[PDB]
Design a binder for this molecule. Sequence first.
Ligand SMILES: Cc1cc2nc3c(=O)[nH]c(=O)nc-3n(C[C@H](O)[C@H](O)[C@H](O)COP(=O)(O)OP(=O)(O)OC[C@H]3O[C@@H](n4cnc5c(N)ncnc54)[C@H](O)[C@@H]3O)c2cc1C
Ligand SMILES: Cc1cc2nc3c(=O)[nH]c(=O)nc-3n(C[C@H](O)[C@H](O)[C@H](O)COP(=O)(O)OP(=O)(O)OC[C@H]3O[C@@H](n4cnc5c(N)ncnc54)[C@H](O)[C@@H]3O)c2cc1C
Ligand SMILES: [Mg+2]
Lengths: 299, 298
Amino acid sequence: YIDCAVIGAGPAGLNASLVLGRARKQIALFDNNTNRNRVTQNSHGFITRDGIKPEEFKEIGLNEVMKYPSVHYYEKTVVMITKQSTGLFEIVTKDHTKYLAERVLLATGMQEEFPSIPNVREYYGKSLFSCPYCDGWELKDQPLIIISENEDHTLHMTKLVYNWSTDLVIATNGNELSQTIMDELSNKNIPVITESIRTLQGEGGYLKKVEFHSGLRIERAGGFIVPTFFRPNQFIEQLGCELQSNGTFVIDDFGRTSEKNIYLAGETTTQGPSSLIIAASQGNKAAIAINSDITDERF
Amino acid sequence: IDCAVIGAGPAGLNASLVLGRARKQIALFDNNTNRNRVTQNSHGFITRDGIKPEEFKEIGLNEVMKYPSVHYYEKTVVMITKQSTGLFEIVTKDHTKYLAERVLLATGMQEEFPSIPNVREYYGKSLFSCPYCDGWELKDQPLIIISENEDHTLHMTKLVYNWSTDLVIATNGNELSQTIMDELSNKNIPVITESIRTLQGEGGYLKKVEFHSGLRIERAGGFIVPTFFRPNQFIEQLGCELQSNGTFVIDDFGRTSEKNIYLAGETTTQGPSSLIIAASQGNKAAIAINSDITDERF
Ligand SMILES: Cc1cc2nc3c(=O)[nH]c(=O)nc-3n(C[C@H](O)[C@H](O)[C@H](O)COP(=O)(O)OP(=O)(O)OC[C@H]3O[C@@H](n4cnc5c(N)ncnc54)[C@H](O)[C@@H]3O)c2cc1C
Ligand SMILES: Cc1cc2nc3c(=O)[nH]c(=O)nc-3n(C[C@H](O)[C@H](O)[C@H](O)COP(=O)(O)OP(=O)(O)OC[C@H]3O[C@@H](n4cnc5c(N)ncnc54)[C@H](O)[C@@H]3O)c2cc1C
Ligand SMILES: [Mg+2]
């Protein structure tokens, strides 16, 4: 049997699979290479891996995991997860292959939803980013833009971005910004454009200029976009996990949900962005809850 | 110096890593007294599973040295005192003195062991403390669980049982409760309550356990339940207030009652965790530090 089916081979699923593999549990690990950070050149902030390529990380971790004879890997798109009348969960893939598991750990991460700006996806990962703690250093002291539609995000995002560069233009892309926020930014020599963006310029995802609807053109080298995130799958929904009084689907600090034998690790947990090292840690944590839960019922 | 980081374990390393990328001025201290230095390998840290403790520490420093705003000092930190300014004064063993706006403590934890002769020679080699870290390498072996306190024995037994079923519990002269004792009898796990006289086996590799009465048993290794303590009194020199969780921490980012004082690594939960978990608590701590600075500087 499968003790735990781990859906997702990012830092979360991988580190969860590593600990569970070392704990002699039968693990089915699933990945389909739709991880959101594959659109970026490098990755930083993961100690001892500061500067590694996102596909190299994936590969090194995937191989450590496969040292352990009980962890089995499937490069397959999981499309359905269903609690049977037998208690087991049935994992089904794109190629109609079926897997039965006593436990499921969802570590599928999330996906970016972008501001209604044309051509934005080409720039995302080369010259436009979403986390300054991750990609600020490489952009430091350059003429930057912040694209932020929702107001309450803009102010915080700006103050943070200002750590890496004091040369900022905020662009709301067609949304109002309180006189409050406008005056505070402008008091820092930071201008604000409330016009909708019509165009980005610069070959191959590398920003040069931004053209607004009015016709105005400024000269930015890159910067930061605030996306909204969604889950690419509807697995939490399929399995009936309840949303909690804290806005999340998780019930303790170990990835346990409202549904017995369903667990979460990584960005699927908080439904907001973190980092590789945090996700890995949450994988380690879920592994501890899963092994603990199995131990309790079997001993 | 925006933040003095005390401790270059995975916590301090990852904290300094993020702060060096946040263009903050960092002083990072470490006196090479990490508890895990007695073990020969580390596991469970993704991409780094199997690495020597030293190699891990080396690679990290080399990585944090990449960022000009961060400078590393291999001194022992003796005193951390506040000042009339609101800053913090940091004094080392060689009496050198350091000033810094904010303080991050990531000095990990130390272990106290049960009163058994020479027990420290086997720890790291054939005696261990966490089944998640070292169970794999010990699977299906003749193991002993040394646990003086009732309240910890059962948990440690159920857990270690994942890796081997050939177990012996040794309470080292301490009483085990009737209820717990019957729970173990059912799973065929023998319990010796007699005092342990000597541990035998050369070069830190356990062979035999001899009890007070004369009984010698064959065992190849196993687990001890240590009490944990803080090596320094820094938290206490800085007057952080103990929350009702049993922790000097007010949130998930290492913040405390004492403004400008942050915590990461094993010093946070004041209980064992892992390389990868501490490391991420460094990250979280960094974020919090930069977020509180940005708030005040804007
Ligand atoms: C442009 C960019 C740059 C970044 N840079 C950094 C950085 O420098 N440092 C840093 O620490 N973080 C960075 N991040 C964020 C980092 O990538 C994430 O925080 C981290 O990957 C989250 O870990 P995770 O394991 O939760 O999710 P992921 O790593 O996203 O893993 C999710 C996995 O689930 C799999 N999956 C999803 N659905 C299915 C399905 N139906 N079937 C099978 N498999 C499925 C995907 O293949 C993916 O592998 C960056 C992100 C972006 C977008
Ligand atoms: C035998 C053993 C085996 C283990 N195996 C594993 C394993 O395989 N995988 C795993 O994930 N975890 C393992 N661990 C646990 C792991 O080592 C710890 O969980 C982790 O290192 C603690 O993180 P930390 O950074 O908070 O503390 P540490 O890494 O211990 O960092 C504390 C640092 O603070 C420094 N320090 C403290 N006070 C001062 C001072 N006054 N001045 C200067 N420097 C100071 C010390 O030099 C030390 O380097 C093991 C632990 C032990 C004991
Ligand atoms: Mg990058």
